[PDB]
Design a protein around this motif. Structure first.
Motif, mmCIF file in Angstrom:
data_model
loop_
_atom_site.group_PDB
_atom_site.id
_atom_site.type_symbol
_atom_site.label_atom_id
_atom_site.label_comp_id
_atom_site.label_asym_id
_atom_site.label_seq_id
_atom_site.Cartn_x
_atom_site.Cartn_y
_atom_site.Cartn_z
ATOM 1 N N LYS A 39 1.351 1.869 -9.378
ATOM 2 C CA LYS A 39 0.899 0.498 -9.197
ATOM 3 C C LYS A 39 1.973 -0.337 -8.510
ATOM 4 O O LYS A 39 3.173 -0.102 -8.682
ATOM 5 C CB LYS A 39 0.528 -0.139 -10.542
ATOM 6 N N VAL A 40 1.527 -1.310 -7.717
ATOM 7 C CA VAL A 40 2.407 -2.273 -7.064
ATOM 8 C C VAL A 40 1.842 -3.669 -7.290
ATOM 9 O O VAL A 40 0.663 -3.920 -7.019
ATOM 10 C CB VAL A 40 2.579 -1.978 -5.560
ATOM 11 N N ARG A 41 2.676 -4.568 -7.808
ATOM 12 C CA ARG A 41 2.301 -5.966 -7.999
ATOM 13 C C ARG A 41 3.443 -6.884 -7.591
ATOM 14 O O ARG A 41 3.690 -7.914 -8.226
ATOM 15 C CB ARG A 41 1.902 -6.240 -9.449
ATOM 16 N N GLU A 42 4.158 -6.530 -6.530
ATOM 17 C CA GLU A 42 5.362 -7.262 -6.170
ATOM 18 C C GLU A 42 5.043 -8.395 -5.194
ATOM 19 O O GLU A 42 3.883 -8.745 -4.959
ATOM 20 C CB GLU A 42 6.412 -6.299 -5.627
ATOM 21 N N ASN A 43 6.089 -8.981 -4.619
ATOM 22 C CA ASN A 43 6.010 -10.202 -3.837
ATOM 23 C C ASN A 43 6.017 -9.883 -2.339
ATOM 24 O O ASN A 43 5.974 -8.723 -1.920
ATOM 25 C CB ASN A 43 7.158 -11.130 -4.252
ATOM 26 N N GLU A 44 6.054 -10.936 -1.522
ATOM 27 C CA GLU A 44 6.033 -10.787 -0.067
ATOM 28 C C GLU A 44 7.219 -10.023 0.518
ATOM 29 O O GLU A 44 6.990 -9.131 1.354
ATOM 30 C CB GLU A 44 5.929 -12.178 0.567
ATOM 31 N N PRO A 45 8.482 -10.303 0.153
ATOM 32 C CA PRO A 45 9.591 -9.974 1.072
ATOM 33 C C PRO A 45 9.723 -8.510 1.466
ATOM 34 O O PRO A 45 10.100 -8.233 2.611
ATOM 35 C CB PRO A 45 10.831 -10.452 0.300
ATOM 36 N N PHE A 46 9.445 -7.560 0.573
ATOM 37 C CA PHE A 46 9.840 -6.179 0.863
ATOM 38 C C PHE A 46 8.911 -5.516 1.884
ATOM 39 O O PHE A 46 9.337 -5.181 2.994
ATOM 40 C CB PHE A 46 9.934 -5.382 -0.449
ATOM 41 N N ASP A 47 7.646 -5.300 1.519
ATOM 42 C CA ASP A 47 6.566 -4.926 2.430
ATOM 43 C C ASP A 47 6.753 -3.564 3.097
ATOM 44 O O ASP A 47 5.829 -3.072 3.754
ATOM 45 C CB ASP A 47 6.382 -6.005 3.502
ATOM 46 N N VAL A 48 7.910 -2.928 2.920
ATOM 47 C CA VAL A 48 8.234 -1.696 3.640
ATOM 48 C C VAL A 48 9.167 -0.847 2.789
ATOM 49 O O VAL A 48 10.229 -1.314 2.365
ATOM 50 C CB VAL A 48 8.891 -1.966 5.014
ATOM 51 N N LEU B 193 11.440 1.111 0.318
ATOM 52 C CA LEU B 193 12.127 0.692 -0.901
ATOM 53 C C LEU B 193 11.491 1.265 -2.159
ATOM 54 O O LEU B 193 11.820 0.831 -3.269
ATOM 55 C CB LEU B 193 12.213 -0.835 -1.001
ATOM 56 N N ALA C 57 12.342 -7.803 4.054
ATOM 57 C CA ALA C 57 13.656 -8.101 3.495
ATOM 58 C C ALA C 57 14.195 -6.918 2.698
ATOM 59 O O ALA C 57 15.400 -6.789 2.484
ATOM 60 C CB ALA C 57 13.589 -9.343 2.620
ATOM 61 N N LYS D 2 11.452 -12.836 8.007
ATOM 62 C CA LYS D 2 11.517 -12.863 6.552
ATOM 63 C C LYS D 2 10.367 -12.115 5.895
ATOM 64 O O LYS D 2 10.376 -11.950 4.670
ATOM 65 C CB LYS D 2 11.532 -14.310 6.057
ATOM 66 N N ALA D 3 9.379 -11.665 6.672
ATOM 67 C CA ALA D 3 8.311 -10.848 6.111
ATOM 68 C C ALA D 3 8.840 -9.515 5.599
ATOM 69 O O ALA D 3 8.268 -8.937 4.667
ATOM 70 C CB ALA D 3 7.215 -10.626 7.155
ATOM 71 N N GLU E 294 -0.235 -7.849 -2.485
ATOM 72 C CA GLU E 294 0.681 -8.979 -2.454
ATOM 73 C C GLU E 294 0.321 -10.016 -1.405
ATOM 74 O O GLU E 294 0.477 -11.213 -1.652
ATOM 75 C CB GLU E 294 2.112 -8.475 -2.222
#
Lengths: 117, 51, 151
Positions: free
Chosen positions: B2-11, B13, C151, C148-149, A82
């Motif tokens: 597989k992971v193809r998600e966006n920026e916000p989560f990153d940790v 979940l 969430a 915001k990195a 990402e």
RNA sequence: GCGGCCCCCUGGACGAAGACUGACGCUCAGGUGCGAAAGCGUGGGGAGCAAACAGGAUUAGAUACCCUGGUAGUCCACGCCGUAAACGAUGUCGACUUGGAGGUUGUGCCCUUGAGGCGUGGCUUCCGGAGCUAACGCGUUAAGUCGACCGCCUGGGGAGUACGGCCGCAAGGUUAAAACUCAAAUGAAAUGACGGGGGCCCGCACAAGCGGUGGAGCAUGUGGUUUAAUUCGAUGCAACGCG
């Protein structure tokens, strides 16, 4: 010298580290870097920070051939995938598509099984 | 896998994927074949509620 | 702290201005239950800021409040061992109260002989985003832009 | 115990209605056969793997796992070895007895015409009566009511141990004791603190602020001292302006 303005990008993902590489259509690479090269020694390598900073570092290193579009060759199920794509879509490049080329071996050889956990 | 998600989560979940891991089948197939054990899905949880 | 409710409480204002905003400023400027001297220093500061600014006192007050105004913040939760915070838009009442208390603490950061003079000078030079609390606003803004990195 | 796909040799099961021999059956002590993975002998083969070992971290303490390497052995072709929680912890073969929702297999005459009506069969799931069962539970594939056989049991340790006779190339496997010792060893059953292993609500304890002092100056009493003694006791949220 010999600007191309078109090519494909190979992306690697692993649990312990991650690297980004870039090549052309036929396959002679032009960029190479390790996210650990930008520092962040230890488990913080898995964090998106090292991956993204290595991404713009490689992009700056590869501006000199003048590229405008690339393709996503992602490898590995490791955390990430990402930071690099959304760091390169605005670094001066426009994406084209996405792929999944992480191998799925057809039950060939015995996996490392000594590992308890 | 597989992971193809966006920026916000990153940790984390992905504990939903931990629940969907089904540690029984992976711990059963990584080490040898059994042919009588993955039944634990049934016949021993509902059928053994003994009081 | 988990079952109670919020009633939007309100306390005694200053009858000259009769504004809830100025009411809250003067009531938080209170210390240990002090009315005469606290309100005296408040009016001294107001008249001095009007004198130094030259413009209308109330609009200068509004401009100062706009200058000190921050935008966003986060809350510490200690979820995963690292900074794992969801940036929540703070309540407008809570945002206003925090701005009030940041102004009051910026005033409090000195130890000057005369409270009236110190208060007047600091609020007056903070009215045009060049005083004391605007550094705290910038520091709080720097605390943002990076939470915001996750969430 | 069996899993890519092609071809050749080949074993059982079951269904449809047809004829055909006329008790030709059941069970099996000694005896032949088969019998996962580790082992041993002749060779062949070696991608990854990993017993023994090699090095680092590891703590009160690792010749423990964690990591990096690494031979036998897992593979092939011939021979030996006869054991396992080889458990459905339920030896085989028959004849009967209340119920339910399925998976699957071929034919019936229709009405596949939709995926509905005959199970007329076989093999299998999961609940649940009468009836058994110390209880859990079994519950037309019985642990029910009966019949024909066989194999096995008489308290726990001493023990599947020792001599002895067999089987093998060895490691070893089958057949099976005593002297001495103990007041027991043991099953099922929620009967509770145990929820350190999981779910659900509660408290200024946590998500905010004001003061305090372990930062300086003065009394407090013990565990207590320098003196003649420095009363009975206040030593876990039950030590302080307390008795």
């Amino acid at each position: 010298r010999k600007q191309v303005s078109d090519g494909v990008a190979h992306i690697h993902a692993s649990f312990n580290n991650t690297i980004v590489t870039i090549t052309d259509r036929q396959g002679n690479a032009l960029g190479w870097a390790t996210a650990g090269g930008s520092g962040f020694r230890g488990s913080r390598k898995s964090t998106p920070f090292a991956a993204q900073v290595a991404a713009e570092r490689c992009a700056d290193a590869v501006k000199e051939y003048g590229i405008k579009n690339l393709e996503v060759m992602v490898k590995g199920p490791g955390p990430g995938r990402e930071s690099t794509i959304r760091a390169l879509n605005a670094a001066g490049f426009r994406i084209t598509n996405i792929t999944d080329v992480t191998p799925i071996p057809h039950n060939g050889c015995r996996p490392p099984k000594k590992r308890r956990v | 896998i597989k992971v193809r998600e966006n920026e916000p989560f990153d940790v984390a979940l992905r504990r939903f994927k931990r629940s969907c891991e089904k540690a029984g089948v992976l711990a059963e197939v990584r080490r040898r074949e059994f042919y009588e054990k993955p039944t634990t899905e049934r016949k021993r949880a509902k059928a053994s509620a003994v009081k | 702290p988990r079952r109670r409710v919020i009633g939007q409480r309100k306390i005694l204002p200053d009858p000259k201005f009769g504004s809830e905003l100025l009411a809250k400023f003067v009531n938080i400027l209170m210390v240990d239950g002090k009315k005469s001297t606290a309100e005296s220093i408040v009016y001294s500061a107001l008249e001095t800021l009007a004198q130094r600014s030259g413009k209308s006192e109330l609009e200068a007050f509004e401009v100062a409040l706009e200058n000190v105004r921050p935008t966003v913040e986060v809350k510490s939760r200690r979820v995963g061992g690292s900074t794992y915070q969801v940036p929540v838009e703070v309540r407008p009442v809570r945002r206003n109260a925090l701005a009030m208390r940041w102004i009051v603490e910026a005033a409090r950061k000195r130890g000057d002989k005369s409270m009236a003079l110190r208060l007047a000078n600091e609020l007056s030079d903070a009215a045009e985003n060049k005083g004391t609390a605007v550094k705290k606003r910038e520091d709080v803004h720097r605390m943002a832009e990076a939470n915001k990195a996750f969430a």
